[PDB]
Structure formats: C-alpha cells, structure tokens
Design a protein around this ligand. Structure first.
Ligand SMILES: OC[C@H]1O[C@@H](O[C@H]2[C@H](O)[C@H](O)[C@@H](O)O[C@@H]2CO)[C@@H](O)[C@@H](O)[C@@H]1O
Length: 416
C-alpha cells in the first residue's frame, strides 16, 4: 500500500523507494510557494511551472522547499506577502501556492523535503516567534552596527530562555499541525498521506539548540505523520559533539550537512588564486562528515552548498560581482570536483546525494521588484540579489546535468 514513501534501508546505509535504492539528485527551491500563488498575491504560476520543467530536464528528482513564513508584512529582509501574518492566521492565497508546488512536483515524479521553520530572518523565523511572545517588535537585525552574534543570541531564546521557550514552542507546534493536515486543494491529498513528501524537516539551521529540544520536537512531528521520514536541518559546521547532540535520537531518521566557504571566511572570490584552498576544504569536509554519519549508522545528504561568480576579474567594482553576464569559472570547477567525490562515495554507500544552493531559473538580479517589493530568485532578501543563483542558461547547468546522470547510473548498479 505504502510502496511509494521513501524509507531508510534496513542496514541503515541509504534510502529506499519502490523497493529499490534511492539517491538524491537535488536542488533548493525555497521561493516555490510564493511563485505558485495567484497574481493577486504576487505569484507567477506559469513561471513556476516552467522552472520545474527545466529542473526535470536537467535530471533533478528532489527539491528542498520552505513550508512556513511569518508576518507582519511591514518588515524588511523577508518574504512578502507572508504565509502566516499573525499566529494561527493564514494568508490563503499563499497557502494555495504550496498546493500547486506539490502538485507540479508530482507530475514530474519528484519528492520534497518540507522545512517547517527558519533560524534566520528571511522568512521571519525564530526571531519573530520571540518578538511575538515578549511583545517587542524591534528585532535586532544584523546591519550597520548589529553583528551576527548579537542577533544569534536574540533568536536562540526560542529554546534557551526558560520562560519564553514553552510559549514560543506552543505556537510553533500549532503551525506544524496545520501543515501536516492540510488538504491539497489542487488534488485532494492530505499532506501527511502524500508520498510526494519525502520528509518533515524541523528547521533551517538551528544554532546550538539543546538535545532535549531535538528529542521532543522530532517525536511530536513523527506522531503527527507516521508514514514519513523526519530530519533536523543541521549545518554540521562545528564538531562531532555538535553532530551527535542533534542527530542521535530515535526519531531523527537521517543526517545533513551545509557547506559555505565564503561565509565562513575560508574563500575569497576577489582573489584570483583563491580556489585551491577552497577545494581542499570541500574535500576534507565530505570525508569527516561521512565518518560521523557512519558512527551513528544513518544516511547523510549535503543539502546546501554554493559559490560566487568570478569577482576576481574586476576586484575593485562591487556591483560587477552580481551581474548575470559575469562568468562562473571558479564556481564551475568547485561544483564539478565535489560532484565527482560524492559519486565515488555513493558507489561504496557512504553518502546519499546533494542539494545545491540554489536555482534561479528565469529570475535575474537586474529586474525590478514586483508590487510587494520582491525580486524573486535563489537568493533570499537578507542577501544581495544574484549572489549564488544558478540561472537557466548559466554554464554550470551542463555540469549539474552530468552529475545527475552519473548518480542515477550508480543507483541502478546497486539495484542488481
Ligand atoms: O548564504 C547562503 C545561504 O546560507 C545559509 O545560512 C547562512 C546564513 O545566511 C548566515 O549568513 C551565515 O552566517 O551562515 C549561515 C549558515 O552558514 C542558508 O541556510 C541561507 O540562510 C542562505 O541563503
């Protein structure tokens, strides 16, 4: 009956679906729900339908999408219009967008990773929940003087403050319940009975949350939808100790890592010699995290990674860095080498696939905002438009297409 839900294999070294091994030929597409909405709510459904076609044609079987976003709608640095402008109150025009995303995905035989919250500010996230509870809407956004560490310590109260946390979490739960139980208006299916969803993911990139928190949340989610896998969203950017705190629990079915060389100060795109130090880092990152996954006997996916355009061709001009016309040779080699390393590890069942960050499609950073002020592409509005996006005609597209073909070949070999 349940032939079609993605499962863990019984040895615990990869995924199964339709009784066969299942490898992740993935991409991130967090802007999907918003592009799926009607024109009245700032959507562009004909564009969404086309962007999914482009992805199927390049060999993609899995999308990691965003399934939350918090008002109020008068805030900078976030998706607008919001999905849930106030607690328990929903924008139905935006919800319908998500219905459509999951229906298209279906017609293209793709599966979805459903992200239910955000630690960062671009969909409201944990910072907004805290604001709602303290009644103080002045979130310390990290611009000007406010540093990242200062904003981080503010949002972390969602689970580290003994008075805030219980309240915050109650409202957080209300949302999960609502989504798990949504009836798809386009095709009738209840979300929790839908084999198109691969898994429910707690949140994007929790920052040093305690183990007990992971323990209770995973259990809650699993009980809400017993047919589905359950995932954590961790970057795994620290040590093995950090890795275990998040992943070692009955109801965390598999593991994740996100890799960001520029953001962490490893790689500098304006430096023409900068590339090989980043390649080494990528290399060691994949093997160390592999061991950690093995130690717990669970599968692993690199659900996030990316790189800038060739800024070093004109280092003294900041804007040159974001033009679509600027080439991506550093980025193309960096991708290629990591794909080749993953193919070889999955040959030996020590790695399950990946999702690059992120697909831009038809969007371009030179286009004007829509009426809600959104320039829709792969880069969230806390970040310069066009930073990391892969456009429909970039040269990196061939590279992604080839990697997907190589990894399907590996999947067939392990089915013998
Ligand atoms: O930057 C691309 C994506 O990076 C991840 O999170 C970043 C975050 O934006 C912070 O700027 C930085 O300190 O590092 C974080 C994790 O390494 C993504 O999950 C998204 O936030 C970004 O679009």
């Amino acid at each position: 009956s349940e032939f079609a839900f993605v499962k863990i294999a019984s040895d615990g070294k990869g995924f199964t679906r339709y009784g066969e091994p299942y490898l992740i030929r993935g991409a991130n597409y967090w802007q999907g729900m918003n592009l799926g909405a009607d024109d009245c709510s700032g959507g562009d459904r004909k564009r969404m339908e086309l962007e999914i076609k482009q992805m199927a044609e390049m060999g993609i079987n899995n999308l990691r999408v965003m399934a939350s976003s918090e008002g109020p709608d008068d805030q900078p640095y976030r998706m607008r219009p919001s999905m849930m402008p106030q607690p328990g109150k929903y924008n139905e025009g935006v919800f319908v967008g998500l219905d459509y995303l999951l229906d298209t995905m279906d017609r293209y035989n793709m599966t979805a990773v459903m992200t239910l919250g955000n630690f960062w500010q671009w969909s409201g996230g944990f910072g907004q929940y805290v604001a709602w509870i303290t009644g103080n809407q002045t979130i310390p956004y990290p611009v000007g003087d406010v540093t990242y560490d200062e904003f981080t310590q503010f949002a972390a109260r969602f689970y580290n403050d003994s008075e805030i946390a219980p309240k915050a979490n109650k409202l957080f739960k209300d949302h999960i319940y609502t989504v798990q139980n949504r009836r798809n208006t386009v095709n009738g299916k209840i979300y929790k009975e839908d084999p198109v969803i691969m898994s429910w993911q707690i949140a994007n990139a929790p920052q040093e949350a305690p183990a007990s928190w992971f323990e209770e949340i995973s259990t809650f989610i699993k009980k809400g939808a017993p047919k589905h896998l359950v995932s954590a969203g961790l970057e795994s950017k620290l040590d093995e100790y950090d890795f275990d705190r998040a992943h070692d629990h009955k109801n965390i079915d598999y593991t994740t890592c996100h890799c960001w060389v520029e953001n962490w100060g490893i790689y500098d795109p304006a430096d023409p010699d900068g590339l090989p130090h980043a390649n080494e880092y990528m290399h060691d990152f994949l093997e160390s995290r592999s061991k950690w996954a093995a130690q717990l006997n669970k599968p692993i996916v690199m659900e996030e990674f990316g790189m800038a355009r060739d800024a070093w061709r004109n280092p003294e001009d900041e804007t040159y860095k974001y033009l679509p016309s600027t080439p991506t040779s550093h980025k193309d080699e960096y991708y290629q080498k990591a794909f080749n390393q993953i193919v070889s590890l999955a040959s030996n069942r020590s790695f399950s696939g990946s999702n690059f960050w992120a697909y831009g499609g038809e969007g371009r950073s030179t286009y004007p905002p829509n009426p809600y002020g959104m320039v829709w592409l792969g880069d969230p509005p806390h970040e310069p438009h066009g930073w990391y996006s892969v456009y429909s005609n970039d040269t990196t597209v061939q590279i992604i297409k080839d990697y997907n073909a190589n990894l399907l070949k590996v999947q067939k070999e392990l089915s013998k």
